[PDB]
Amino acid sequence: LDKQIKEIKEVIELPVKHPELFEALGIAQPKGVLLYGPPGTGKTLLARAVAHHTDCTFIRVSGSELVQKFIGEGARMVRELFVMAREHAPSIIFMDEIDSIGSSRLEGGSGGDSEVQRTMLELLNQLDGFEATKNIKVIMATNRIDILDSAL
Amino acid sequence: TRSEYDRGVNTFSPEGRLFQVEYAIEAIKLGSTAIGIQTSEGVCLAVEKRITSPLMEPSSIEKIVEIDAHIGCAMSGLIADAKTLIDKARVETQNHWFTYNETMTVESVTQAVSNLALQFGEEDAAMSRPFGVALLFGGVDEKGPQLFHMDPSGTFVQCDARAIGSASEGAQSSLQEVYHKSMTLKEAIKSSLIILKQVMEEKLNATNIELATVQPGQNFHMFTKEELEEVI
Amino acid sequence: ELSEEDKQLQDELEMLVERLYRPALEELRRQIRSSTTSMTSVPKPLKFLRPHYGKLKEIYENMAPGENKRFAADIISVLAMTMSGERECLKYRLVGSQEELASWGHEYVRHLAGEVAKEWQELDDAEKVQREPLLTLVKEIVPYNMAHNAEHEACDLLMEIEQVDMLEKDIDENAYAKVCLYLTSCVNYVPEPENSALLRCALGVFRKFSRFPEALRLALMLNDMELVEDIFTSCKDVVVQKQMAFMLGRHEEYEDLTEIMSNVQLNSNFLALARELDIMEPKVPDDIYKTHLEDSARMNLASSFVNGFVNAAFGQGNKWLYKNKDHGMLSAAASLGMILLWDVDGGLTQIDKYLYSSEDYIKSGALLACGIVNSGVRNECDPALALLSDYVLHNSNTMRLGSIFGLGLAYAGSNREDVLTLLLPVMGDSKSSMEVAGVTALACGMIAVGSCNGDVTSTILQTIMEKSETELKDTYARWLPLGLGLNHLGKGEAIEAILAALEVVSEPFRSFANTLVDVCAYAGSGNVLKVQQLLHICSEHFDMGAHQGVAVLGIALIAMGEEIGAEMALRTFGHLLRYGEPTLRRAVPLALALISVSNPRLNILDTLSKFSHDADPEVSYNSIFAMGMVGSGTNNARLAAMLRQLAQYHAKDPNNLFMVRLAQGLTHLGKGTLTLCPYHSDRQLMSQVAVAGLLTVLVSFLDVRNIILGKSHYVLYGLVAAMQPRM
Amino acid sequence: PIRALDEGDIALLKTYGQSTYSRQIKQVEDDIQQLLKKINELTGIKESDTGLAPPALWDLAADKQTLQSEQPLQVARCTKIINADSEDPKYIINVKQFAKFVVDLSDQVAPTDIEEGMRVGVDRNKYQIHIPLPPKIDPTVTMMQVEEKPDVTYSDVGGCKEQIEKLREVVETPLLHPERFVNLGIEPPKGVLLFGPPGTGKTLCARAVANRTDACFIRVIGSELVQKYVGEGARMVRELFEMARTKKACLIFFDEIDAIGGARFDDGAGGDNEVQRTMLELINQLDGFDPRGNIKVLMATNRPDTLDPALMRPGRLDRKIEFSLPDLEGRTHIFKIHARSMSVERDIRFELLARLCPNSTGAEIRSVCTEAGMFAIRARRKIATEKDFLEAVNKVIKSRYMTYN
Amino acid sequence: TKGPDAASKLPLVTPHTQCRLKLLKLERIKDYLLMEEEFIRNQEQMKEERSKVDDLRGTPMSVGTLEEIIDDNHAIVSTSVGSEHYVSILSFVDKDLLEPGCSVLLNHKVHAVIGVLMDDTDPLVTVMKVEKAPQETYADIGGLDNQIQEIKESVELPLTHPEYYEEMGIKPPKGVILYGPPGTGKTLLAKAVANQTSATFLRVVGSELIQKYLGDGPKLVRELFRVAEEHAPSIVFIDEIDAIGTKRYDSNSGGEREIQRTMLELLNQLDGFDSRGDVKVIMATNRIETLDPALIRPGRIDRKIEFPLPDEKTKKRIFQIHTSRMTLADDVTLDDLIMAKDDLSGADIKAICTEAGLMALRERRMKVTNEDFKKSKENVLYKTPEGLYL
Ligand SMILES: Nc1ncnc2c1ncn2[C@@H]1O[C@H](COP(=O)(O)OP(=O)(O)OP(=O)(O)O)[C@@H](O)[C@H]1O
Ligand SMILES: Nc1ncnc2c1ncn2[C@@H]1O[C@H](COP(=O)(O)OP(=O)(O)OP(=O)(O)O)[C@@H](O)[C@H]1O
Ligand SMILES: Nc1ncnc2c1ncn2[C@@H]1O[C@H](COP(=O)(O)OP(=O)(O)OP(=O)(O)O)[C@@H](O)[C@H]1O
Ligand SMILES: [Mg+2]
Ligand SMILES: [Mg+2]
Ligand SMILES: [Mg+2]
């Protein structure tokens, strides 16, 4: 996985360590990475190695952690997580199985996963939106992206 | 509510309505307006065309089509259905002439076209939805000039002056105001053109309107370009 | 990493530095092929010979002429510009006979330019011999820059520490858009007279390229009338000469050159553009107001002011003028003359008919009408000059108080010796009254328009030398400093002698004198040291007030060029009025107004509104007049609405209602056809015309309670003198 | 085929291809940002209001206050006067969430003015009654009563004559001419559910009746009936109806009631049963074992298809009124009213515009008039025309018909 | 109705290309800023009865909620325990600011009326308030000219030219949707409005109006709109309204009905019974087909702006914007990407530019090349059967 290591290294390490290169090029800082693959080909060992080798606050959000029963809770949790990241910047936020917490936006009202969908929408806005981020990198992993939502 | 009563022509609603039939009646509205008048001197028809842009010749938006030498037909609604019902009308008129050697009266002709529009889903004929076209047959039978309106639900009636189409409710009032029995065909032409001008968007100008007249005399006359300019 | 071939190259470098000298020079210099590489950064030999940098430097130190010592300097200096090794070694290399830069890269060119610059700053006027080789260098580099379109960098070298002519002279042709606009901006923001240096540099560029309807306006920025005639001289094409004459007036074939310069037909052009989208309509005050949507002489004055400000110069009186009550002074007669602005034809007749009339308030008004009408238009047959020179010579107020401002209106911005000789001897006013002396200084300065006239400066200096201790610090004696400032504009540091002479004046006064002289001096250009001085002189707490007021007006006047500076000054003035004394608060609105006259931006509007309903009526008046000045000549929307809300709030306040209605009249002023904005051309001219009027207006409004709500009102018609068309 | 910058490569990056005046610019940018931070630290805090008064109205030596104060009443509501035991009444009180005390009277001149529910006074440690207070009026309950008449009339609700006639009947006619209903022997209905497609003038009719009504009006804020503290919503409904009965003749205007109460099935809605409960209280108030008085309700709901049949049944909502996507004449009238105030030529064919807007809600008619104005403004003309209106129609109503000639 | 707040933005030096003109301009900013800081430090460092009165004021002032003022000096207040008291009124209050529901201040021991706190806005809304000025003015919005014109008519012109509408009685639009695919500028056209609008801007996220406590969402929404109306002639940007905007259904759970309640309160605010001040709503969404006609209605949302995947000219201008600040190579023609009609977003163009710069940096270079752009497109793009047509 040498090429994958080099690409992930690029996106995450290079900006935080050496923002001046990106500034000189004039290119907007890359802001996020997402991992494809069958179940047993890295996608979290790489996250573990990056955390072990980063000089920045590493965080995990993996799983269904953002899906909690009481409404108006997932959005608050994601927002407070990104508040934590901004407070302890520079930082790398890992999200294993984003398809759980955020996937295809199927219709709601009767039989739609409206709540997990709202969690995803808050995550969308925090990753990018009005008053965007400075040095917070976000890594996501998914065993099959096909259903992962287009906005993300 | 109308989720299981208006999805089929053969399923009555609690009110006693044929909602597919009212929906066809609505589909009549969409069309370009037509105004037929019947006076002592004949029958006049004035219709609005909706030319989207040139390169679409005049002889493809058929609002007026000639029904035998003694009737004209103004269409309002879906073109395919209009063609089918006009074809029914022509074949009926000619068959009646062939069998009885006389000119089919406009009552008979509109009755028979209605008789075709009746058979929505009857299992003895073959359509499944009402013919979404409202027609005006303006002709000259032995009872003097006559004008008969047909709606998609197979109902036909005499009309001393009737407007149809998108400009239906907005022109029935004008016809109500202006029409009087002792009217000459020149008055009919001018009045129909005035009402059309009132209820059109583009400026009436002899290439956005068609006109025809069937008289107790010369046959169905489709006004030509110079005549359009003269009247306008 | 260090791919095998890369490490082989590194080992080649190791052998080269460890190992007679001709091959070393050859291959070491050819290894700069890495830098010459059209597609590469990180020149490998650079940073591969990092550990050897000290060895190479010490070898060069212990090197002597011969086969070596010639081309090794190139490698030494490239490794230097990478790390260490300043212009001593750079120029040793260049003396090594490699100045071409063709065998080196754009990166090395820019680094060399920066290095030359930094040695130039490090050096002083001494050791100027080294400059000459460096000048030949700069001459050798600049063509490379004009080749590879680094025009910004070339202009950087030119502007660097000094002024340069050779390059922008030899800047080719038909590619001068940069050297034009970019250097125009650099000029707009320069801090020193090397501003004027870049000014006539750009002028010379235009002249060399024989297309200078931009040096046209540059002439005014160059405070050199001699340069104005120098530009006027060539004028090889009558077609462009016509446009130049029109521009001069707004700011071979001799029949019409002087006519266009004097603008004998500007009234015709203005009326033609009025016919274009005609708005010609003698009106009623309420319509400018909206009293239906809700006979004091104060209301008479307000109505006259609004009506005049709106219908100015449209050629449309005693009947409605007759309603006078003490303060019912010549305001309305001046209003009629103004509504007749620039209409000398009927102006003569109407003003004569209404001068052969009742007492002072009808003859002084007539003289002011003549002057204000003549403002902006000149002719060989001098109009109103005979009346001004013959009538009203006795020592008294009213008569001369109006007549002198009328003469200033007639011939402001002329520096004409005839009117100078008319007004300077008459300046002697210890015999006459104090306000009369003030208005005489006003007119003298408004005619001087920064001429630096020694005679008028002497008149003002002797007048202020004439000192009555109690008179000085009472009111209505500050227009001697005002005239001095008008006589001296933006001449730079050529004010120290005047300041030293004035330093004899008494301590409590002369703060205004010094501050107003200084501000009427350098201003619009933008000098950070100077605005520092202004802010500090504001910042000394006094437990004087008008001294901080003049300082505030000065911050406004200085921050009138750069829009960046104007916005930062808006911020500063918000701070000032927030953490400020009542005098400072009163002064802040004037500064806001000067920053944005007739350019009603929502930020200034909001700030003034928020400060309007204040406990101090003076603060309130300053804020509402600031509203009027920001909205002047724009008809801007929602200014009238919020202003009517303010009026209804101050329903029963007489002074507040009068001044707010005046602000509404300013809002509808000229129906949009006339704007008070300075900077007529390219928004980049401290326009000698209408700056005098605006500054007089602001100085007077520095104290509104005493003068405006007193015995004088000619401030408004001075603002009108500043007025100019927007078409 | 891929290489990562390392050692001196990365310094050569950002040192080699660079402007000599680049580090200076970066440093000045960084310190401009830091000076922004420093100035925001120096200032950026305001003294706030805090309700401090201006002078000449204050009081010095106010120590009389802070020497006599603290009265912890409003938590006193006598619930059982203990029979008064003849002498020594021995009142009782409920301080609500806190406790239920038995209490005496202190300094009270007339130890009868307690009325057994009169919201008496009480002290902190010993709870002796001190002074009685008037009944409780909830701040929300009193604020819900629309006091500013809206600025609409029964001449701007265009395209609805039958609906306005029915609403006017039920709301106004019994109130202002009671003779006819009693003379003819018909008890006027009390209850009207206004429904229809989203946007037809429902709230507009409500505003118009509010403007024309000489009777109490209660614009029941839908969200001021779903609180925390289970039972609070039912208490709010009870208090609203009590205030109504207090008033002489009342018009309640429950709007957006689809929020307050749809069905009654729970399944997973057991946690959201408090709204169901306040909806049940609303039903029992609207009609139950109690005369309701001169209270007339004009409920509004865009979706009377998920409402509870208990609320819908015509014992509480008597004149269910549909608003229809206005016909051609109604569209003519809507266009005419919305263009009454505009700068439009005196020859626009508003009949034609009505025809061109099929099955268009009055909201979309308003939108078309306003977009016609926008197009006129963009073209920079002081008078719009029928062409501008047609452009607006194409813009709004629709947002190829080659087979519907 | 306090009045507009907006945000404080420093001026923008026109040049972007690295230039000594830019250095000079930015040093101008520096010097005026240092001057402001000086004035502050100098004047505020260089340079009784009410003091003792406020001392008498209870130091740890608590907050209650007034209810049913009585008499002139005896007002009823409450406490954050569900209890309430018949407290006294001191002589320090301005009076006439005390209204039911007013969050009043009280003394710790005496429990009197010792303040009015006419400043209480919920933290969940004050954090959402906007005070920064995001540097995204209408210069980086490549193309989208019609959309910018419509949004300008909706937001700016009834502030900077309130004469056109009053001249002809028309009233400005109150709401605008921006709807479309994933990445078109729907949020840039909000950022630029924030930039150039001298009116308060209010962030909003649909996932932020859903609150845990039952009934709290349709109180947070009321707080939001009351803050908008009171605090300014302002703009409210509900980003990602599809977070609450889904069509109202019968539902069988509690959470869905609560979300629908939040929707209903939003609608009541937008066009309720009473009225709406000068608050202009700007809403954003990826799918407009999944919203309630209630909020898509043309009385609350008077304009709708598609953001279709930008066409060829707009795509060109977008490459222009997002490469302007880059060292381009003369061998680069920014038309290979233009000509191909592959679905390319504005965000996709940005990512292409960034990735291209990265490939160059890996190639040990700091200036883009055509091969680098080709690789960047190929490795950035993420994602009808042949012969079924034609
Ligand atoms: N390329 C690899 N090199 C080394 N170990 C690997 C590699 N691919 C998979 N593994 C092994 O897989 C395990 C790591 O789990 P992995 O990172 O694949 O899980 P994941 O990202 O959580 O995936 P999923 O979502 O499918 O559960 C370890 O046993 C690791 O040794
Ligand atoms: N028939 C109509 N007559 C007059 N104005 C109308 C009509 N229909 C709509 N409007 C206009 O629509 C707005 C009134 O909308 P209203 O608040 O009544 O809608 P609603 O149907 O109650 O909608 P909601 O579903 O949001 O409750 C006003 O602009 C009014 O001018
Ligand atoms: N016209 C444009 N010019 C330049 N960049 C644009 C343009 N349109 C979109 N962008 C890019 O959009 C990115 C921000 O996301 P954008 O506003 O497009 O998202 P969205 O899908 O419209 O909305 P949301 O953020 O609510 O999901 C910025 O990086 C900017 O590069
Ligand atoms: Mg995994
Ligand atoms: Mg409604
Ligand atoms: Mg966006």
Residues in chain A: 152
Shortest CB distance from D16 goes to which of C107, C114, C156?
C107
Which among E188, E312, E343 is the best mutation to test ligand 3's pocket, defined by most ligand atoms within 8 Å of the CB?
A: E188
Query: Mutation test of the interface with chain D: which of A8, A9, A20, A73, choosing the one with the most D Cβ atoms within 10 A?
Result: A20
Cβ distance C41 to D8 less than 8 Å, yes or no, reads: no
Query: Mutation test of the interface with chain A: which of E178, E207, E248, E292, choosing the one with the most A Cβ atoms within 10 A?
Result: E207
Q: Give me D393's structure tokens.
A: 């129609």
Q: State whether residue A146 sits within 8 Å of chain E by CB.
A: no
- Smallest Cα–Cα separation from D192: which of D323, D284, D280, D321? D321
Helix (H, G, I), strand (E, B) or coil at A23: helix
- Smallest Cα–Cα separation from E237: which of E177, E182, E316? E177
- Smallest Cα–Cα separation from C52: which of C76, C68, C27? C76
Shortest CB distance from A21 goes to which of D2, D14, D26?
D14
Sign of the alpha-carbon torsion through D178, D182, D183, D185: positive
Residue in A closest to E209 by C-alpha: A72
DSSP label of E45: I
Q: How far, in Å, CA of C679 to CA of C199, rounded?
A: 16
Cα end-to-end distance, chain D, whole Å: 66
Angle between helices C434-448 and C479-487 (to 10 degrees): 10
Longest Cα separation, chain A:
52
Q: How far, in Å, CA of E66 to CA of E75, rounded?
A: 8
Q: How far, in Å, CA of B164 to CA of C422, rounded?
A: 90
Cβ neighbors of D38 (< 8 A, separation 6 or more) are E37
The secondary structure element, H or E, covering residue C94 is helix C87-95
Cβ distance B79 to D405 less than 8 Å, yes or no, reads: yes
Do the Cβ atoms of C71 and C96 come closer than 8 Å?
A: yes
Q: How far, in Å, CA of C384 to CA of C382, rounded?
A: 7
Q: How far, in Å, CA of C288 to CA of C723, rounded?
A: 19
Which chains have 3 or more CB–CB distances shorter than 8 Å to chain D? A, B, C, E
Q: Cα separations (Å) of C667 from C313, C633, D256, E202? A: 17, 6, 46, 32
- Residues whose beta carbon lies within 6 Å of some atom of ligand 1: A 1, 39-45, 96-97, 141, 143
E218 labelled binding-site residue = no
Q: State whether residue B65 sits within 8 Å of chain D by CB.
A: no
Do the Cβ atoms of A116 and A82 come closer than 8 Å?
A: no
* Binding site members of A for ATP: 37-44
Q: What are the chain D neighbours of E367 within 8 Å (beta carbons)?
A: 17
Q: Cα separations (Å) of E175 from C595, E234, E282, E303, E304? A: 35, 12, 6, 6, 8
Q: How far, in Å, CA of D219 to CA of D147, rounded?
A: 10
Cβ neighbors of C727 (< 8 A, separation 6 or more) are C269, C270, C273, C274, C276, C673
Q: State whether residue E364 sits within 8 Å of chain C by CB.
A: yes
Q: How far, in Å, CA of B69 to CA of B218, rounded?
A: 9
- Smallest Cα–Cα separation from E244: which of E226, E258, E224? E258
Strand order, beta sheet including D295-300: D216-218, D250-252, D295-300, D192-195, D321-322
Do the Cβ atoms of C396 and C432 come closer than 8 Å?
A: yes
- Ligand 3 atom nearest E239 alpha carbon: 26
Q: Cα separations (Å) of D270 from D5, D173, D264, E244, E257? A: 61, 43, 10, 22, 12
What DSSP letter does each residue of C380-401 carry, written as one string?
SS-SSHHHHHHS--SS-TTHHH
Q: How far, in Å, CA of C443 to CA of C413, rounded?
A: 10
Q: What experiment produced this structure?
A: cryo-EM
Q: Which long-range contacts (CB under 8 A, 24 or more apart) does C1-6 make?
A: C1/D3, C1/D4, C1/D6, C6/C44
Helix (H, G, I), strand (E, B) or coil at D283: helix
Q: How far, in Å, CA of D177 to CA of D233, rounded?
A: 35
Cβ neighbors of B88 (< 8 A, separation 6 or more) are B112, B113, B116
Q: How far, in Å, CA of E53 to CA of E90, rounded?
A: 11
Domain boundaries, chain B: 6-232
φ and ψ at residue E252, rounded to 5 degrees: -140, 10
Cβ distance E163 to C637 less than 8 Å, yes or no, reads: yes
Sign of the alpha-carbon torsion through D30, D32, D35, D40: negative
Longest Cα separation, chain B:
55
A-E contacts at Cβ under 8 angstroms: 118
Helices (H) and strands (E) in chain B, counts: 6, 10
Q: How far, in Å, CA of E97 to CA of E95, rounded?
A: 5
- Smallest Cα–Cα separation from B130: which of B17, B227, B18? B18
Q: State whether residue A21 sits within 8 Å of chain D by CB.
A: yes
Sign of the alpha-carbon torsion through C220, C225, C229, C230: negative
Q: How far is the CA of E179 from the centre of ligand 6 (A)?
A: 10
Shortest CB distance from C42 goes to which of D13, D19, D21?
D13
- Cα R_g (chain C), whole angstroms: 32
- Smallest Cα–Cα separation from E150: which of E343, E345, E280? E280
E367 labelled binding-site residue = no
User: Would you call E48 exposed, middle or buried from its count of C-beta atoms within 10 A (0-12, 13-18, 19+)?
Assistant: exposed
φ and ψ at residue E296, rounded to 5 degrees: -75, 0
User: Would you call E57 exposed, middle or buried from its count of C-beta atoms within 10 A (0-12, 13-18, 19+)?
Assistant: middle
Q: How far, in Å, CA of C127 to CA of C125, rounded?
A: 7
Q: State whether residue D21 sits within 8 Å of chain C by CB.
A: yes
Q: How far, in Å, CA of E291 to CA of E306, rounded?
A: 15
Query: Mutation test of the interface with chain E: which of A8, A10, A14, A25, choosing the one with the most E Cβ atoms within 10 A?
Result: A25
φ and ψ at residue C217, rounded to 5 degrees: -75, -25
Nearest Cα of chain D lies from the Cα of E166 at a distance, in angstroms, of 9
- Smallest Cα–Cα separation from C85: which of C62, C119, C126, C110? C119
DSSP label of A58: E
Helix (H, G, I), strand (E, B) or coil at B210: strand
Cβ distance D405 to B82 less than 8 Å, yes or no, reads: yes
Q: How far, in Å, CA of C163 to CA of C201, rounded?
A: 8
Strands (E), chain B: 34-39, 42-48, 64-67, 71-77, 133-141, 144-150, 156-158, 161-164, 209-214, 221-222
Decide the pairing of beta strands B42-48 and B34-39: antiparallel
Q: D–B contact (≥3 CB pairs within 8 Å)? A: yes
φ and ψ at residue B150, rounded to 5 degrees: -125, 130
Cβ distance C637 to E198 less than 8 Å, yes or no, reads: no
Residues in chain D: 405
Decide the pairing of beta strands B144-150 and B133-141: antiparallel
Helix (H, G, I), strand (E, B) or coil at C129: coil
Fold (topology level) of B6-232: Glutamine Phosphoribosylpyrophosphate, subunit 1, domain 1 (3.60.20)
Q: Give me C390's structure tokens.
A: 């013959």
Q: Cα separations (Å) of C457 from C445, C495, C516, E227? A: 9, 12, 14, 60
Q: How far is the CA of D4 from the centre of ligand 1 (A)?
A: 24
Cβ neighbors of D286 (< 8 A, separation 6 or more) are D191, D292, D297, D311, D315, D316
What DSSP letter does each residue of C661-684 carry, written as one string?
HHHHHHHTGGGGSEE--S--STT-
Q: State which residues have CB under 5 angstroms from ligand 5, the bound ion.
A: D 203
Q: Give me D230's structure tokens.
A: 């289970």
Do the Cβ atoms of B139 and B106 come closer than 8 Å?
A: yes
Q: How far, in Å, CA of C677 to CA of C674, rounded?
A: 9
User: What single letter denotes the amino acid at residue C21?
Assistant: Y
Shortest CB distance from A6 goes to which of D2, D14, D18?
D2
Cα end-to-end distance, chain C, whole Å: 69
- Smallest Cα–Cα separation from C633: which of C589, C602, C678, C590? C678
- Ligand 3 atom nearest E284 alpha carbon: 26
Strands (E), chain E: 62-65, 74-78, 84-88, 103-106, 113-115, 175-179, 201-205, 235-239, 280-285, 303-306
φ and ψ at residue B67, rounded to 5 degrees: -110, 105
Q: Cα separations (Å) of E61 from B39, D123, E54? A: 93, 21, 11
Cβ distance E198 to C572 less than 8 Å, yes or no, reads: no
- Residues whose beta carbon lies within 6 Å of some atom of ligand 2: D 156-160, 198-204, 302, 326, 334, 361-363, 366; E 267, 271, 294, 297, 299
- Cα R_g (chain E), whole angstroms: 27
User: Would you call D266 exposed, middle or buried from its count of C-beta atoms within 10 A (0-12, 13-18, 19+)?
Assistant: middle
Strand order, beta sheet including E280-285: E201-205, E235-239, E280-285, E175-179, E303-306
User: What single letter denotes the amino acid at residue D374?
Assistant: M
Which numbered ligand comes closest to the C-alpha of D203? Answer: 2
Q: State whether residue D4 sits within 8 Å of chain C by CB.
A: yes
φ and ψ at residue E176, rounded to 5 degrees: -145, 125
What DSSP letter does each residue of B4-66 carry, written as one string?
SSSS-TT---TT---HHHHHHHHHHHTSPPEEEEEETTEEEEEEE----SSSS-GGGS-SEEE
Q: How far, in Å, CA of D226 to CA of D261, rounded?
A: 10
What residues are paired with D290 via a beta bridge?
D288
Q: What are the chain D neighbours of E84 within 8 Å (beta carbons)?
A: 74-75
Cβ distance E32 to C565 less than 8 Å, yes or no, reads: yes
Cβ distance E130 to A131 less than 8 Å, yes or no, reads: yes
Interface of D with A in 4-23 (CB under 8 A): 4-5, 10, 13-14, 17-18
User: Would you call C84 exposed, middle or buried from its count of C-beta atoms within 10 A (0-12, 13-18, 19+)?
Assistant: exposed
Q: Give me D368's structure tokens.
A: 């078309």
Cβ distance C114 to D21 less than 8 Å, yes or no, reads: yes
Which numbered ligand comes closest to the C-alpha of A47? Answer: 1
Q: State whether residue D32 sits within 8 Å of chain A by CB.
A: no
Place of tokens 């002329």: C414
Helix (H, G, I), strand (E, B) or coil at D256: coil
DSSP label of E42: I
Residues in chain B: 232
